[PDB]
Ligand binder design. Structure first.
Ligand SMILES: *Cc1c(COP(=O)(O)O)cnc(C)c1O
Ligand SMILES: *Cc1c(COP(=O)(O)O)cnc(C)c1O
Ligand SMILES: [Mg+2]
Ligand SMILES: [Mg+2]
Ligand SMILES: [Mg+2]
Lengths: 389, 379
């Protein structure tokens, strides 16, 4: 059995991978994918996962297989990659730059049903003029600011919403919907505050759609979501789809917001112990910030996990030990409480492998060309992901 | 031709005239000290950047991973120091590089790692070259500078084990917390002294120690004398960054890496311009937050590279940066100053962190044309 025997001899596990490596526990990932799709199905709304967390074709394929409708992307590079992989229904959810209009036009002309978003009269004018010149009715949604976080028209700003919506509609473009992202949910840590923010996000985005429609303008989609508000919303009246992406893996920021446990976290960075400073209680590992990223989202939350929570090779949290510091290719493993562990070298011998849970999975993942997707039998497979623009 | 007007954004642009001045400045300082410069390529991981460093007089390179050793060896560079405590599990990869003809040097700071190297080398018929890392300032790895028994035990393990004990090295990375010439000079002296002290203790015990290697970019530029030292290692100086400007070893105008970004909208009530360089372009590094002037997620410059003091990225989401006044006020009519589609260039907090976010740099020539210079990602 030639292929079998060769593949067996080539197969990696967590003991044979070189470190650092970004490992996806596939069973935890599938539980996360099921949980989010079940919740949206219960709310009677579509799920349009945001692939910026993974930028990985097989990850998005698992989201689609579970029932997802389309994807959200954060770059046109993502739109190109996932359209080539067979995803047609793609929302580019970053305010459209006019100079990217030729690439968006080429993606639509090759058969990608690519939606763009704007929040200004001038961006709507640019799209409509290019669309008229090029004989393309782009679909464009208007981004709404519901929580003061980032881009978007105020939900209560009827004159600007009308001006933008008329610019698109009069200009022969398809005004397809409104969207909002309540990213301020990341500053909360109670179920009450998260439920209230999810209600403000839904209410505001539906308010903007109702004002466009009261002026005779079409607005068939109402799209909301962050992972914390997707999991917290009690009701989604008026909403057609919810966008969420970090949930596929979760991370320690999400654990601190309270929408998951550390044991739901599916992404970890496999690392090796490469030295010590025994008098300071330090183990030095080969996962520095270039593996973890410089994200320190947990520093301002209820529990600071430094550059990440230490787990053993079986993925079980080792409470009390975190990466307290990080240089580029070296992480400093020590007690979070600030005590010097006695005998750090017997606790973590040279060559020991550990798995570090990330502050932010979106930021850790981008540091790696690929993930190693870990199956229940202990084998891994390389799953590429996209870097750059 | 491709230029700053035609590139998609965000893009990581190296101003070649600025890079070359940085290259010349460091090389000239190391010449004046009578030491070799072994640049640390972990800042750029880019073959043409290191080629310009070599053209100006650099001797060999330092790398932070064996993937960089593979890349630079495949491009013809053979004098490579891998300056991260060696993991025994990567010994097969190091061995294959040496057998292929790469003169790859490894480092250790423990008896156990030295025993692992020496046993594998004897079995494989390879006299690995290994330097001992010395801790001269409490920053990271290494044998304590006055820890002679540890030093000698590692040295004897290597040399009596049939390996080539090639040298000692230190990196005084605590230089990054300083911001005065006096304090940088004293740290550079402490770095030099402790590294030299270790070499002398090896030699006094009859062990070879031909290389004494020190450096960080701040201590390379601040050191008043380098007696006893054979080479200096420095990397971030090739581009500089705002961390370095705040340490005081360069000006913002010297920073040769910037991120070209387009204005994609505004929040006029807040005086924000939104740009398409978020933290995925800048990285999450916020090293200037702990220094005397905080530059947020980066210092704004105009398309010509003019620094615009007082505008910085005060915040950043993944693919959106928030450009606003550093003084906290709301710029009145921000959209009339920076209309949609305006291009700006952002100086990074940490050149090593921002560079790693991009698959390639755009190297900007005097005539305004660019050439793409790929760089390495991953392990
Ligand atoms: C990232 C993002 C999402 C998903 O939010 P998470 O909390 O990261 O899952 C949704 N919509 C927009 C516009 C996004 O940028
Ligand atoms: C990065 C590094 C250097 C170069 O110091 P910079 O201040 O970044 O130029 C030298 N030696 C070692 C061991 C390093 O890790
Ligand atoms: Mg995120
Ligand atoms: Mg491109
Ligand atoms: Mg650095």
């Amino acid at each position: 059995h030639h292929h079998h025997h060769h593949a067996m001899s080539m197969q990696d596990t967590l003991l044979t991978l070189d470190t650092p490596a970004a490992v996806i526990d596939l069973d935890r990932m599938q539980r996360n994918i099921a949980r989010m799709q079940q919740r949206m199905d219960a709310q009677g709304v579509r799920l349009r996962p945001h692939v910026k967390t993974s930028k990985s074709v097989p990850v998005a394929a698992a989201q689609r297989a579970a029932g997802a409708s389309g994807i959200t992307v954060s770059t046109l590079k993502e739109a190109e990659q996932f359209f080539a992989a067979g995803t047609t229904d793609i929302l580019y959810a970053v305010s459209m730059a006019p100079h990217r209009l030729p690439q968006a036009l080429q993606l639509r002309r090759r058969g990608c049903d690519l939606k763009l978003i704007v929040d200004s009269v001038a961006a709507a004018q640019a799209i409509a003029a290019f669309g008229r010149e090029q004989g393309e009715a782009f679909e464009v949604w208007i981004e709404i600011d519901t929580d003061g976080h980032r881009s978007g028209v105020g939900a209560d700003d009827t004159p600007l919403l009308l001006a933008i919506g008329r610019t698109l509609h009069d200009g022969g473009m398809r005004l397809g919907g409104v969207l909002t992202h309540a990213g301020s949910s990341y500053e909360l840590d109670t179920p009450e505050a998260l439920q209230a923010l999810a209600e403000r996000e839904r209410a505001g985005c539906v308010q903007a759609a109702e004002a466009l429609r009261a002026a005779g303008l079409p607005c068939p989609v109402v799209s909301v979501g962050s992972t914390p508000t997707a999991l917290a919303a009690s009701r989604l009246d008026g909403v057609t789809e919810v966008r969420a992406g970090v949930y596929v893996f979760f991370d320690l920021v999400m654990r601190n917001i309270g929408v998951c446990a550390a044991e739901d976290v599916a992404l970890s960075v496999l690392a090796t112990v490469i030295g010590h400073q025994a008098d300071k209680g330090w183990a030095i590992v080969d996962a520095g910030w270039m593996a973890m990223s410089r994200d320190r989202g947990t520093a301002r939350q209820k529990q600071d996990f430094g550059y990440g929570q230490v787990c053993d090779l079986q993925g079980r949290v080792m409470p009390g030990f975190v990466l307290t510091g990080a240089n580029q290719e070296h992480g400093i493993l020590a007690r979070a409480d600030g005590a010097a562990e006695a005998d750090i070298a017997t606790r973590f011998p040279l060559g020991t492998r550990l798995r570090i849970l990330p502050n932010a999975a979106c930021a850790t993942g981008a540091q790696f060309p690929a993930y190693q997707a870990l199956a229940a039998d202990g084998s891994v497979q390389t799953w590429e992901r996209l870097h750059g623009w």
